Amino acid sequence: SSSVEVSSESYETIFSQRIIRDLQKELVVGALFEELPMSSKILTMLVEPDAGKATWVAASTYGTDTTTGEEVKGALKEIHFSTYKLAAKSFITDETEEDAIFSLLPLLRKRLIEAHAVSIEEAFMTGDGSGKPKGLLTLASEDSAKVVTEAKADGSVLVTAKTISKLRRKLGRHGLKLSKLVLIVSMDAYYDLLEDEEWQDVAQVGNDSVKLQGQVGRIYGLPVVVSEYFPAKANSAEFAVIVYKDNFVMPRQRAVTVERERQAGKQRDAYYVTQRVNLQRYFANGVVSGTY
Amino acid sequence: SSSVEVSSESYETIFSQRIIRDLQKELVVGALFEELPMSSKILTMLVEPDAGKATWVAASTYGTDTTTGEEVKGALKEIHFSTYKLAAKSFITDETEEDAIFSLLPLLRKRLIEAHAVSIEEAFMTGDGSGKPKGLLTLASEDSAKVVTEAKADGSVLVTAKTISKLRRKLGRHGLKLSKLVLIVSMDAYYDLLEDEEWQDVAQVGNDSVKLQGQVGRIYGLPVVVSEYFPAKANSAEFAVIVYKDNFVMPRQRAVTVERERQAGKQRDAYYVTQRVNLQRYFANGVVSGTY
Amino acid sequence: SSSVEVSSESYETIFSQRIIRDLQKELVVGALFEELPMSSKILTMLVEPDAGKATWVAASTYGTDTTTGEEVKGALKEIHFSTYKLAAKSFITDETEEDAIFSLLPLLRKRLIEAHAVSIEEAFMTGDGSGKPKGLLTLASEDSAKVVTEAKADGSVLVTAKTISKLRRKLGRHGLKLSKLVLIVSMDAYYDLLEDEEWQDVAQVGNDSVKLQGQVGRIYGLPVVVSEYFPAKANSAEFAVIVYKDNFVMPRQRAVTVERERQAGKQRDAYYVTQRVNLQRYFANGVVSGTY
Amino acid sequence: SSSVEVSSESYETIFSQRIIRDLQKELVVGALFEELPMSSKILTMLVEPDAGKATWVAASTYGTDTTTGEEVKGALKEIHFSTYKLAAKSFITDETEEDAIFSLLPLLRKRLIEAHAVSIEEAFMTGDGSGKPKGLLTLASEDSAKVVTEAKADGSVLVTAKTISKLRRKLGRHGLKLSKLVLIVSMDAYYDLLEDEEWQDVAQVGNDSVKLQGQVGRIYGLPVVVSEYFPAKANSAEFAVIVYKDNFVMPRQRAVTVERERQAGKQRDAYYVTQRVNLQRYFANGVVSGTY
Amino acid sequence: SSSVEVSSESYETIFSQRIIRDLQKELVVGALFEELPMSSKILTMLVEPDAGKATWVAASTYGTDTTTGEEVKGALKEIHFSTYKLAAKSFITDETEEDAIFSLLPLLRKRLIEAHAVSIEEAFMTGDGSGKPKGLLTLASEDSAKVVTEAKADGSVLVTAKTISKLRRKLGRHGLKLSKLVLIVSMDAYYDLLEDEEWQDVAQVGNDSVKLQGQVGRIYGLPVVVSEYFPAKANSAEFAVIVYKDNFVMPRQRAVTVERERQAGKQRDAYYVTQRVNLQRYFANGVVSGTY
Amino acid sequence: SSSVEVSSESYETIFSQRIIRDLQKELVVGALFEELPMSSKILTMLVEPDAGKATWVAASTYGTDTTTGEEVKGALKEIHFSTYKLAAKSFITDETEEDAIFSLLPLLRKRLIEAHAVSIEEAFMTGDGSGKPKGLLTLASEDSAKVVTEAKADGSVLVTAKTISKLRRKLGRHGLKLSKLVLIVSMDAYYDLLEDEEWQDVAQVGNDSVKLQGQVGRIYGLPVVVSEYFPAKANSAEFAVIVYKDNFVMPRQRAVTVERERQAGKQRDAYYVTQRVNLQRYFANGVVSGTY
C-alpha cells in the first residue's frame, strides 16, 4: 500500500539484540606449555656436563702412568633465554562513541585482549624469532633445524599412519615422550575415517556413540589438537610432536596487562595492550615435525 | 437369466464404509525444527559481538607513543527476519452435496488440512524464499551458499560412506554437530543393506532381527530420515545433514487457523485456511548439503 | 520244484493291508492368510481417504479473496470383491467297487476332499483369476502388476541373497511388512547352507547342531515356507514375499461342503465338492515377488 | 657245545597262553536297524492310503453335469516281504581236536558263530537278494535304486561336504531323517584334521583333546559310523546316509540259533549255526547313497 | 717380564677341580616302555585268537545235510621270545690309578655305567636283531617291515602337519591309539614353529607364556619326545608314532648289575657292566614310521 | 642508541648456569652377568666330566675273558682363569683450574669414573680379548666360534622373528635357556610393530598403554636389552642370545678404585683409575649370536 517516500519509515525495525562473537576458535598450541612469570632482562643457564673420560690401565701398583693414565675434559655450553616484547595499540574517538549508542566501548575492550592473544599464538607457531618468540615449526622444521620425516625407520614406502609412528619413535631416541599431537584439520579428518586391522572402523562399528567418536579422534589415546595455524605447503602435511611436560615453558617477562591514556593529539581515548614473551630452547631435536 | 436391463438392478450391491487416506507418509524435515511464536511483524536483530582487538607492542612505559596504533570498534550485523504467507480457500456448495451423502465435509476439513500440510513441507524442504519459507536444500546447496562436498578432505574419488564423513567434519569446524541425516529413498536403499567391514552384514548377519536393521538405518547411530522430497540432478546425490536442535528455529508469525464464511454469492460454504511462516538463518554454512 | 501250475496258488501268499497317503507334505501358501467366512454375494464398498488439501496464501486480510484459497474434493475409489467358484466332482459305479469289497467309499471321500484341497492351492499360487481365485506369482509379478526386483537399490550384480534384501526393501517402501517368506525348495536347501563370513559356518560350527541349521534356514529369523508349486522359465527364481497377516484375507462365500447324490441314470454314487473363495487386492504393490 | 640235540630240548620252551582273534572290528551296518522278531514265512502288506479326492465343482447344483462328476478310487499297491535263509556249518573230527589240547571246542563254537555273523553282515551290506537278505547299498546306489547325486543343486563342482548335503536334503524330501551316517575310513581320516575357514581347524582348535575329536568325527553332530566294509571302486567314495530308526526293518523268522549234531559217517562232531532274515524295501528311494 | 723358568711358577695358579659327566640328556626313547623282569632264556607260548567260526546254515533241521558241514579249527600261532646280551667292560690298572688322580675310580665307575646306558639306547633305537635287541625304527621303517606312510590316505602333496595326520589314521586302522610322538631335534624345532590357520603361530603368539611353548611342542595335545639318536636318511625324515602304553614291552632276563674282578693273571682292576634284554614284536603294523 | 661497545656488556647480564649430564642412557650388555669378586692371581682347575664307560658283556661266568677289556679314567682337561687390566690416568693442573670456577674438580672426578665405565663396556661388548676382556659379540658370532644361524632346522626362507627362533632352539641343544635377548635399536624399531595373528598389533591395538608397549618390546615376554654399542655390520643384524644366569660369570680380580697423586715434577693434579677383569668361557657353543 504505502511505498518508500509515503510512510514506510515509520514502522518497527528490530535490531540484533545479543550478537555472536567474531572468532569462535580456541586459543591453544602457542600456550600449551607451563606459563612461568618472569621480570628479568635475560636468563642465563649452564649444564655440567662431565669430566674426565677414563680408560683401561693395566694397574699392579698404586698410581700408574706407565701405560695410559691421566684424562680430563671440561666442557660447555652456556645458554641464554632471549626475551621479546609483543604488544598492540588501538584508537577510539569521542566523535565515534557519542551518537546515541554508547554500548560500543564495553564490547570493544574484550575484543582487544582476545585479539592480542591471537597474534601471539600465530607468532609462536609461525615466526622467525625477530621481534617475536622462537618458533615451533621453525625449530622443528627443515628450514633451520633440518628435521624432515624419519628415514632411519623407513625401508622404502610409507603411509600416513606410519609417519606418526616414525616421528613418535624419533622422540624416544631424544629420550622424550609424546603427550599430545598437534595436527592439521585435514589430517585429523583423514584419521577420523581411520583404517585399522580391527576391521570394524572405530568411528562407527555398528552401534555408535560419543565414546567411539572421542576414541577415533584421539591417536594413541592422546588429545589431538585440531588446529589451522599451518600453511599448506603442497600435498605435504606438517605435524608437531614432542612431549608437553618435559619440553618447553613460556617465560613471560610481562604478563598481559591493558594500559590506557586519553592522549593521541586530542582526547580521544588510546588503548595499549602489552605483553613480553618467549619460548625456551635447549635442543634443535627438542621438538620434531616431519614433511609428508 | 438375470441380465442387466432385465432384473439385475433389483438385487443386492454392497457399498463401502470407511476409506483409505491419501498419503500415509510422515510429514517431517520441514517440521523438524522448534516452533517459536512471533507477534512482531519484522525483527531487526542487530548482532553485537566485539570491541577492540589485539596488537603486538614492546611497551614498558605508562604512556607509549612509539609502538603501534590502538583500536576501537563498533559491531555488526543487522539481520531482518521477514515472514511469508501461505494459505488457501475451498469453495463448496450444498448443491453438489445434495444426493444422499452428507458426511463428506467432516473428512474434507481434515483432507484440506492434511494436504495444506504437504505443501508446507515441500516449501520448507525446497524453496528460493520468495513467497515461501526458506528452503532447506537450497539454502545449504550450491545454489545460494556454494556449499557442496568438502574438497579439502579429498584427494579425488569419493565413495558413498566417505562423502558423509567429509560433510560430518565440515559441520564441526562450524561449531555445530549432526543428529539425523535426510536421504533420498533410493540412496537409503544402499544403506538399508550396505556392504560393510565386519564382513557379515550389520543389517542382518545371517539371522536378521529388527535390532540389526534398526542399527544400520541409523548411520553413526543417528536416525536416517527417509524422505522423497528431493529434486533429481542425475546419478548425483543430495543430502540434508545438520543438527536439528541447535540449528534454525521455525518462526511461525501466525499459527494455522481456519476461518469459515458462507458468503460467495449465495450460500455456499466458504473456507479460508491461513498460516504465516519462515525459517531462521544466521549463516548458510550453518546448514550443509553436498554433491556425490 | 514248486512253481506256477503245481499247487503254489493254493498255498500261502500274504496280500495287502493298509495304505500310506499320496503326498506326505502340507499344503501351504494359498492358505497362509486369514480365512474369514462370508455370506454376502458381493463386497462392494466405497473407500474415501481424502478431503480438503490447502495451500500457501499470503493473506493480511480475514477473507482472502485477493488470491484463491479454496480447496476441497471428494475421493475414490469403489471396488468390488467378487467371489469365484472352485469345485471337484466324481461319478463311480457300484460294479467297480464290488467283488467282495465295499469299504472303498469312506476312504474315497477323504482322497476327494484332499485332492480338491490341492487344486485350491494350485489356483491361489498361479491362476489367471477368472472363474477361480487370482494368483500370487501371476498377480504379483510382471504378468499383471509390473513388480519384479528393485533395481534402484542395486549397485550392479544381483546375487541371490542380495535379491531377497532389495525385495525386502521394496516392501517397506510400500509401507507393508514381512512376516513369512516363500521360496523354492531348490533355493531353500542353499539357505539352509548359507555362506556367512562368521567363518566356521553356522550349520556345522565344529560344535555342530540342529539349532544352527534351524536358524540359518530361517532367512531373517522368519520361517521359510518351502514350496514347489512354482512354474519353470529357465532357472529364474521366483519368490513370494509379503506381510501375511496385515494384507489380504481369503474370503469364503461357501465353506467346503460335500453334496452327495446317487441318482445318475443308474446308482452309482455321485459326489460333488464345492467351495467359493477369492483373493483380494488393494494395490499393485500389495504383494511382491521378484524375478532373478 | 650247546646246539639242538645236546640238552636244549629239556630246557625251557614257552608256548602261547591266550591269543588274539582274527577280527577286532565291531560289526556294524547290517545289524543297525530294528530287529523285529518274526515267525511267518512271508508278510504280505497292502497299503491302501487314499480314497476320494473329488473335484472342484461349479455349484448351485448337487450332482454336477457341467463338469466331470464325483470321484472315488480304491488303491494300490500290495507288496510282499519274503524271508531268505542264511545258514553256515562246520564239522570237525576227533582227529582234528586231538594234539594235546582238548579245550578248543568251546572256543571253536564261539568262533563259528562270530564268523557266520560276518557273512550275514557282508550280505546285508551288499547282496543281490537271492538266498541272502537284500543289500543295503545294492538298493541305495546305482545298482537298482538308480539313485545318485542330485544335479538339481549343482552349479558345477561337487566336494565331499556338499555331496553329503545333497544326499541329506534328498531324505527330508522323502519324508525321513538322518540319524547316523555310514562312511569310508579314508574320507573320515580327513575330518581327523578337517580343513576349514576358521583356519585354526574346528577339529582341534587350539588345544586338541579327545572331546573335540569325537564331536568333529561326526557330521551334523550325528555319529559317523566308521567302516571299511564297502567295496573298492576307484577314487569314487560311496556313502550311506539314511535314517536309522525310521527305516527298513529286519524281520527275523529265525533269530540266530546254535545247532549241534555229531552224525556224518562216524561221530565226529558238527556245528551248525542258522538265522533267517531279510531286509525290507518300502521304497527304492527309501535309502540314499550316491556317486562321488 | 717374568715367564716360565724365572719366577712365574712360584705364584699360585689354579688347576682343575670339579667334574661334569658325559651326556646331559635324558635316556629315553628305547627306555620309554615298561621294563618287565623275566628269568626265562626263551619263552614259548601260543597266542590263541579264535577257534571255529560257524558259517551260515539254512536249517529247518537238527542235522543239516542240505548245506556244507560245520566249520571248526584249532588255534595258531606259536611265538618264541629270545633274550639277547648287552654289556660293556673296562680293564684298568694299579699303575694307571697311581700317579696323579687316585679319586678317578669313583667317577670312572659311574661313567662306565652311564655310558653303557646310552649304548643300550643305541641298540634299542636301531637294532640288528642279532646279538642285541630288535630295533625300534628298524621294525617300524622300510628296513625289515616295509612300513612307510599310507599312500591310501594321501590327498596328494604330503606336508609336515599332514604326514602325522595320515600316520594317525594308519594307527586307528590297527585299532591302537596315538599318545606320544618321537621326533628328531631338527624337525621338532620346525614343529615348535607350527603354522596353523590362526596365522600368528601358537608358539609364542604375542602374549607368550610357558604353556604356549609347552603346547606347540605338543602335537595333538600329546608331548613329543625330542631325540638325536636318529639317523639322517636323506631329505627324508623319520617319525616314530605309536601308543606308548599298549605296545611292546621290554623283557629283561637280567637287570643291570656291576660285576668287579681283579684277575687276568695279574691285578689290575676289571669292571664289567652287564644286562640281558629283548624287545617284543607282535606286529609290524604294531609300530608305525614313515618316509617324507 | 645502544649497541655492543657502548655500555651493553656492563648492563645487567644473566651469566651461564646449571647442568645436565652426557650419556643419557644406562650401561647395558657388559653388565648382564654374575659378578664374582676374585682375590686370586689365577685359578688353574680340571674339568671333570666322565671316568670310564665300559661296554657289553655276554657273561656266562662271574668275570669274562671272551669279551673286551674294562675302562676307568681320570679326567680331562685343564682350564685357566686369567685376568686382564683396564685403566687410565688424567692430567690437570692448578693453572687450568684458576679462572673463577672451583666446582670443576668435584664434577670432573665423577665424569672420569663414568668415562672409564664406558671404555669397559665397549671392550666388553666387542674386542679381540687380547689385553682387554673378551667381546660378548665376538666369541658368540662367526668370528671366533663359527656360530651363525641354525641352518639344519631351517628349511626355506626367514624373517627377523625367525632368526631369533633359530637361535632360541640352538641354546637348548646345549641344555641352556634364555633369560635376555640383546638387540640393535634399528631392529627394536621393527619389533615395535610386531606382525602377529591378533592382527591389530599388540603395540597399539586401538587403545595404547605403557603395558602393551612393555609386552610387544619383550620378545617371549623376556627383556630385550636395547643397546647401541653394536657394530654396524651391514644391512645384517646381529643379536646376542644365551642364558645370562646359567652360563658365564664375569670375574673381577680388582674392583674399580681411584688412586690419586699430585706429584710428577710439578704439582699438577694426577688421577689414576684402575681395575682388573676377565670374562669366562667354557665352550664355543655356550654363547650364541647369529647373522641375519
Residue numbers in the entry:
A (entry chain E), B (entry chain D), C (entry chain C), D (entry chain B), E (entry chain A), F (entry chain F): 164 to 455
Paper text:
The first procapsid form, prohead I, is built from 775 copies of the head protein pb8 arranged into 11 pentamers and 120 hexamers, as well as a dodecamer of the portal protein pb7 located at the 12th vertex. The DNA-filled capsid is decorated with 120 copies of the 17.3 kDa protein pb10, which binds as a monomer to the centre of each hexamer. Basic principles of T5 capsid assembly and maturation have been established and follow the phage HK97 paradigm. Here we investigate the properties of pb10, the decoration protein of bacteriophage T5 capsid.
To explore the nature of the interaction between pb10 and the major capsid protein pb8, we first searched for the position of pb10 on capsid structures determined by cryo-electron microscopy and image reconstruction. Two density regions corresponding to a single hexamer of the empty expanded capsid observed without and with pb10 were obtained (estimated resolution of 8 and 9 Å, respectively). Pb8 adopts the major capsid protein fold first observed in the X-ray structure of the phage HK97 capsid, and its 3D structure was modelled on this basis. Six copies of this pb8 model were fit into the density of one hexamer in both cryoEM maps and the density corresponding to pb10 was identified. We did not observe any additional density inside the capsid in the map of the pb10-bound capsid, showing that pb10 is located at the outer surface of the capsid. The density corresponding to pb10 observed at the centre of each pb8 hexamer has a size compatible with the NTD of pb10. It appears as an averaged low-resolution lump, likely due to the superposition of one pb10 monomer in each of 6 quasi-equivalent positions on the hexamer. The CTD density is not distinguishable from the noise, suggesting that its position relative to the capsid is variable. The centre of the hexamers is formed by six copies of the A-loop of pb8 (named by homology with the equivalent loop in the HK97 capsid protein) and its surface is negatively charged due to the presence of multiple aspartate and glutamate residues in these loops. No shift of the non-expanded procapsid band was observed in the presence of pb10. This shows that the structural reorganization of the capsid protein subunits that takes place upon expansion creates the binding sites for the decoration protein, as observed in other phages.
